[PDB]
């Protein structure tokens, strides 16, 4: 019973159109919820609500405070690669090197003479979009939380890297942790425990992959 | 249904230009994130260049600045302009696309791949 | 400060498609909220679409909603406007502007402006 | 998002000396604003130090739900950029970040720099004003997502105009649903408080609502 | 009763010096923060310099190093020493103080403002 | 014989746009550098923006990104596109040009100035 | 390793003028020798004009000499091509290219290339 | 840019000596031309002595020449004024000032000023 | 000081000569103005004095101490002071005098760190600020001959007037200077004037001789 | 290492006031616990007041409590002592000292010392 949403509705602006209308779902401990939908459906807004950045006008949200959020939009702080990944968290080599492996970063990092000690600027203009996205995801999965909110992390990644990361990181490395993935890929949806399809703030579908297949 | 058809490959001299083209045909509601990939003999398939629907592009370090990925959303076509070719670029070039079939009730994508294009760059 | 330069304008057949680009020269491009604005002959500068520095927030004018798409590339210091299914109403000089203040769509909050590009549509 | 309770709490900084806090009692409900007023040396900071566990009570009991963000009386800046100073090991969210800056009256100052939030702070890069330093320190504290916010005299080195804007848009609007303990002796601030604790030489001289304080 | 009275203003030439003074009179139990603010025509009121009871000072970037804020806690007076005056400093200077009235049972403050003092930096001066 | 004529000035509200124009008339063999300068009350005359024959532009820090200098070499005209006007931009705007008169046997220039255009930004 | 993007192409009547721009995104722009190249229908990519890294050296194709002008702005990471007095012969796809090696006009020495812009000169 | 604070003032009998100090708080102290200025009651601020950022150039008012000495310590961000063989004429408020412009002794060229110290002789 | 007799040179063997039969004699402490159309061969003439261009015919004579100011400003990574002094030893008087003359004092004093602000991974200056720093560096170098190739090219007419009058004319008053300029305002103050057009010398003489149309 | 220099001493009538200043020359001023100490002639150095590096902790001698106030300005590298309602007992040489070890009021813990200033309280 890790994440629970009951008749939840919220608005970004008072008196406006609700960004999310009567949202219901229950994600059990260690399950994978896939959040699909059209552009502007309210997917990020739903994650913003779980984070407490969006307050519901009506309904109730229940979860344990330990949340790690991966943005759609990569952000890299000034400092080394290691500084960016480990961040506020303490350093454990097994966890660090396992996360690098899972997030397809080992080859890129080893290409540099200074390895993880290479200094990045702000925004990581030196790195590629994919390298930036991988560092951002690595940082998020390196944070030890009870819930992982991954908002479209594979957006600027090639299909081959995305396949490796989804299989070895989202599915293998984070297997026992409750996680919410914003994705509209069938390839990802097949591996989901439950699927939420949003369209214009409303829940168009909620159920298993087999239930979605039967439509 | 939906098919991806690459064209533009061949045997060229080093320093030559080449334009690969890959068009999506069939019942397509929308296409998201098309890209180009390459596989040299014995080695594994890897990215060359990727392009979002909106037009944001990413490149492999080896091709960045030399190759240019572009797309015509009206024609559902992705293009790889390959300039200053090196014998290191010799490989089979594959085209990828995240396509939503019209038949699908929701805006969900499926991964489609091309048959491949052989590009061979000779030193002489 | 940031120096903006638009490109991609011209003449198009109705229901057509056109893509505008705007490259910014200067520091901290990610701090600026980028916006596309149109000035119709005789009319004032109207807001078309906006992007937050991150790219996380995108807002469009009701008239262009569902047809126009605003995007950003902070690594390339560029902002784009994909204008699909164009109508003769969209004929105007398209301006690209930067705002150093967070989240407004009113052109009054945008300090840095480009030269503009003429975009004409005929039925 | 917490409950703050104190029952007959007394504590000493030095063994066998004078108690810094004598018989303190209060209950702050979820999302409420407690104003802690008093003369210099009253024991206000010491009360916050106790909530943080840095001061152990000799007698009495304290209850709260952890996840506390503390804003010091004395501004501190780490070497690095403005962004580095505000986010401080907390995951970055543009909306939250840019909203906190707006609320803490930092947007205008930051936009005055060509490098904006990427300007390097400390001796190496730049020297900010007392007010700029205080605003960055408060921004950092309000950026941290906690259940309880302990704000020890943050407006101390701020002008009355900026303080008014920050109190109204940050303390009252931005953090409206979060439990807050604000160390302030200003009536302007006290009128907006849910409960008020007035300390004098370690002792509680007043505890109640603004209306109860008005009736004195 | 609390009254804040500014003095020292006037018409001066550019480069001139000037000392503004503002004294708190009436039933004052204590004062903790005092400051000088200015409002130029058409523009909004802004800070110039602020001073804590203990004497810690902050300044506007435009005045830092040129202007000096000081206070006499015995006299309940704040002072602004204005050096190397520029025509940009032409404005109405207001005095502010966080005062505890003798009537208050606790050490609680209220914001008090002066009526202002005009400072004009121009060649119209002697 | 050779003259610089400014136009486009006036009284505007803050945030308004304005386009100053300055045309070189008479016997002109060629023009090398063109620029916009301003003089606010009590302050000294200073550059706003300058433009080389080839089109390279420089700006004052205060106007960079907000103002845009352009030139039509065919029309012998320099333009100052003034966006997001502030009451700090109120001044007299002067136009300058390094002109070679048709009478000169060699490619040697002379400095020419305009009479000035008053720009007043109200708040 | 610079990413090049051209703009400014289109249709023009003979004797007309057009200005092409090319922004490069990447490090050490000043190291690169920038060049404009044209690909006529049926023909190979031919050299048009080149600029050295700092702009001290400019070279042009005999055909365009006296009509075309190459310029650079290292601060804005852009290279420009001013095409005056156009002839129908100049109809081609104009490419902007960067060379990491000093002083060659041959397109074989240019590693980084842009998408190109079509320029059409009618009569 | 620089905050100045003088010290060392007070009462002395004629023929006596006094040493004034002035510490600067801010960046690039060495860029500034430091100067000592005096303002007698009823008189304007008059120049006394000046030091270039380096300390290479020292200039004194004709009245104080041979009796007063200006010195600098860039490591300690301080400027000093040794006033020997004092006359009752030297009674004035001594100010310490910084100029961001090279080589002027006119107090009009000095932007940053200290509070001043009263010297009685 | 500087002499050129029947000098001709080519950049490419079997091409068109960049400079054709150039003649001039510049005495010690004199100001030679080099005017001409774009591509006339002005920079190429200075390149020849530097030894970067070898004459095919003719002779060039001069004293080795040369300080050259490029048309194109260049800035090294480091502080403003680091950029102006460069290799040369530091003298406060010379330094602060050069800054004043080159209209840099006001810009430098606008920064809190003054001349110690890092330039090039650091602040970006305007075209004019860069041109002024480049000229300052050149005039700070103590040489017998100063080759100033179009230094005022990216400067506004007001700054250029101040710099020409106080730096080129006042500060450098006793040094031999070759100034590449096509401005009448500058030409009036020249000792001798050389006008180039397509590698050829169209005029060589005094301002009075040039005035006599 | 830190070099300390006191100022503000002199002669005053009883019931009067005096403010002492002490500027520190050296690195990491904020690390040091600053203190004011007084040496009565033919008496041991006595502690007067102390302030932590932050300024968060201030301690005073019982004799001076309620009359003296210790303050700090880390930006100006100075520590101050406001001595109000002075008694003839306060006549001593006031020293300023720095301690690299946290929170002790004993002068034995302070390594760096100033020259001192004589304070004389008459009547
Ligand atoms: N921080 C915000 N403040 C105010 N309004 C917002 C904010 N974020 C989003 N919105 C608005 O609410 C809507 C929610 O869109 P949202 O980003 O949640 O959809 P989405 O599924 O995440 O879209 P996408 O697939 O593009 O990420 C948007 O249309 C937007 O205008
Ligand atoms: N960490 C500490 N260790 C020992 N004594 C301390 C400590 N902190 C404070 N004290 C002492 O307790 C009292 C300080 O109380 P405190 O500083 O909390 O009051 P305050 O209301 O915060 O004062 P102010 O308004 O000046 O911040 C003083 O007697 C001080 O010496
Ligand atoms: N290093 C070089 N190698 C070969 N040719 C060069 C070199 N530098 C310049 N040239 C050529 O020599 C000719 C003379 O150009 P030059 O640099 O002297 O122009 P200029 O007289 O200085 O005028 P401007 O500087 O205004 O362009 C030009 O055709 C130029 O391309
Ligand atoms: O702009 C309003 C602001 O309020 C939200 C909603 O809860 O979140 C704020 O609340 C926390 C306190 O729990 C603040 O510290 C945080 O900075 C705010 O973001 C969110 O909509 C908005 O950011
Ligand atoms: O100097 C004593 C020090 O110890 C206290 C005791 O409450 O607080 C500590 O608490 C934890 C131990 O659980 C330490 O890890 C932490 O760093 C200390 O703050 C407090 O009096 C003092 O800080
Ligand atoms: Mg989203
Ligand atoms: Mg406190
Ligand atoms: Mg760091
Ligand atoms: Mg040249
Ligand atoms: Mg160096």
TrEMBL record, chain A:
ABC transporter domain span: 16-215
UniProt subcellular location: Apical cell membrane; Cell membrane; Early endosome membrane; Endoplasmic reticulum membrane
Highest rank taxon of the organism: Eukaryota
Family to which the UniProt record says this protein belongs: Belongs to the ABC transporter superfamily. ABCC family. CFTR transporter (TC 3.A.1.202) subfamily.
Function: Epithelial ion channel that plays an important role in the regulation of epithelial ion and water transport and fluid homeostasis. Mediates the transport of chloride ions across the cell membrane. Possesses an intrinsic ATPase activity and utilizes ATP to gate its channel; the passive flow of anions through the channel is gated by cycles of ATP binding and hydrolysis by the ATP-binding domains. The ion channel is also permeable to HCO(3)(-); selectivity depends on the extracellular chloride concentration.
Descriptive protein name: Cystic fibrosis transmembrane conductance regulator
Organism of this sequence: Homo sapiens (Human)
From TrEMBL, chain D:
Locations listed in the record: Apical cell membrane; Cell membrane; Early endosome membrane; Endoplasmic reticulum membrane
Domain ABC transporter: 17-216
Family: Belongs to the ABC transporter superfamily. ABCC family. CFTR transporter (TC 3.A.1.202) subfamily.
Function (record text): Epithelial ion channel that plays an important role in the regulation of epithelial ion and water transport and fluid homeostasis. Mediates the transport of chloride ions across the cell membrane. Possesses an intrinsic ATPase activity and utilizes ATP to gate its channel; the passive flow of anions through the channel is gated by cycles of ATP binding and hydrolysis by the ATP-binding domains. The ion channel is also permeable to HCO(3)(-); selectivity depends on the extracellular chloride concentration.
UniProt protein name: Cystic fibrosis transmembrane conductance regulator
Natural source organism: Homo sapiens
Gene name in the database record: CFTR
Part of the whole protein covered: 389 to 636 of 1480
Automatic annotation (TrEMBL), chain I:
Subcellular localization: Apical cell membrane; Cell membrane; Early endosome membrane; Endoplasmic reticulum membrane
Every ABC transporter domain range: 15-213
Coiled coil: none
Function (record text): Epithelial ion channel that plays an important role in the regulation of epithelial ion and water transport and fluid homeostasis. Mediates the transport of chloride ions across the cell membrane. Possesses an intrinsic ATPase activity and utilizes ATP to gate its channel; the passive flow of anions through the channel is gated by cycles of ATP binding and hydrolysis by the ATP-binding domains. The ion channel is also permeable to HCO(3)(-); selectivity depends on the extracellular chloride concentration.
Homology family: Belongs to the ABC transporter superfamily. ABCC family. CFTR transporter (TC 3.A.1.202) subfamily.
Record-given protein name: Cystic fibrosis transmembrane conductance regulator
Phylogenetic lineage: Eukaryota, Metazoa, Chordata, Craniata, Vertebrata
Encoding gene, per UniProt annotation: CFTR
Span within the parent record: 391 to 636 of 1480
